[PDB]
């Protein structure tokens, strides 16, 4: 629990998947105390791919990556940015099902 003081910058720990879509991925975490924004780094869990990792900044602890592939693992690391320095790196293991015809 949070003793109840404004000083340290605790990173996101309450990382949970709000919804699992084979076309998009939605995530939601707990807000940080002090930070003004969060850095979202979307990187592929597999070494296969040309396009490098994506880096965007969101104002809310909830981010949705539109345009994805079914049955593909992703790596999203969230960080509580306040200004000069941010919080520790805390990401979750993305995952999406497979739509269409299922051949065994």
From Swiss-Prot:
Function: Probable collagen protein.
The protein, known as: Collagen alpha-1(XX) chain
Localization (cell): Secreted, Extracellular space
Tissue specificity annotation: High expression in heart, lung, liver, skeletal muscle, kidney, pancreas, spleen, testis, ovary, subthalamic nucleus and fetal liver. Weak expression in other tissues tested.
Stretches assigned to the Fibronectin type-III domain: 11-98
């Amino acid at each position: 629990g949070s003793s109840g003081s404004s000083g340290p910058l605790p990173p996101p720990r309450a990382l949970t998947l709000a919804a699992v879509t084979p076309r998009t991925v939605h995530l939601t975490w707990q807000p940080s105390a002090g930070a003004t924004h969060y850095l979202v780094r979307c990187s592929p869990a597999s070494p296969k791919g040309e396009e490098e990792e994506r880096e965007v900044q969101v104002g809310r602890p909830e981010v949705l990556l539109d345009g994805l592939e079914p049955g593909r693992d992703y790596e999203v690391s969230v960080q509580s940015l306040r200004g000069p320095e941010g919080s520790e790196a805390r990401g979750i293991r993305a995952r999406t099902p497979t739509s269409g015809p299922s051949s065994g």
